[PDB]
Design a protein around this motif. Structure first.
Motif, mmCIF file in Angstrom:
data_model
loop_
_atom_site.group_PDB
_atom_site.id
_atom_site.type_symbol
_atom_site.label_atom_id
_atom_site.label_comp_id
_atom_site.label_asym_id
_atom_site.label_seq_id
_atom_site.Cartn_x
_atom_site.Cartn_y
_atom_site.Cartn_z
ATOM 1 N N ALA A 86 0.388 -3.830 -7.410
ATOM 2 C CA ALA A 86 0.280 -3.808 -5.921
ATOM 3 C C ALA A 86 0.009 -5.225 -5.402
ATOM 4 C CB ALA A 86 -0.870 -2.888 -5.507
ATOM 5 N N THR A 87 -0.559 -5.341 -4.231
ATOM 6 C CA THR A 87 -0.848 -6.691 -3.669
ATOM 7 C C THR A 87 -1.414 -7.596 -4.767
ATOM 8 O OG1 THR A 87 -1.257 -5.919 -1.426
ATOM 9 C CG2 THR A 87 -2.361 -7.947 -2.120
ATOM 10 N N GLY A 88 -0.700 -8.632 -5.119
ATOM 11 C CA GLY A 88 -1.194 -9.554 -6.183
ATOM 12 C C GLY A 88 -0.061 -9.857 -7.165
ATOM 13 N N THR B 34 1.513 -13.290 -9.008
ATOM 14 C CA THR B 34 1.944 -13.998 -7.768
ATOM 15 C C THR B 34 1.442 -15.445 -7.787
ATOM 16 O OG1 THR B 34 1.845 -11.937 -6.520
ATOM 17 C CG2 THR B 34 1.807 -14.000 -5.274
#
Length: 23
Positions: free
Chosen positions: A8-10, A22
């Motif tokens: 997910a986010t990252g 990322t």
């Protein structure tokens, strides 16, 4: 498995069916 939240986010979406870092 991806860390810091996971894919997910990252992590970015890798075309190998996974998630990269990322920077």
């Amino acid at each position: 498995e991806n860390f810091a939240g996971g894919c997910a986010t990252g992590y970015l979406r890798t075309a190998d069916g996974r998630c990269k870092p990322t920077f």
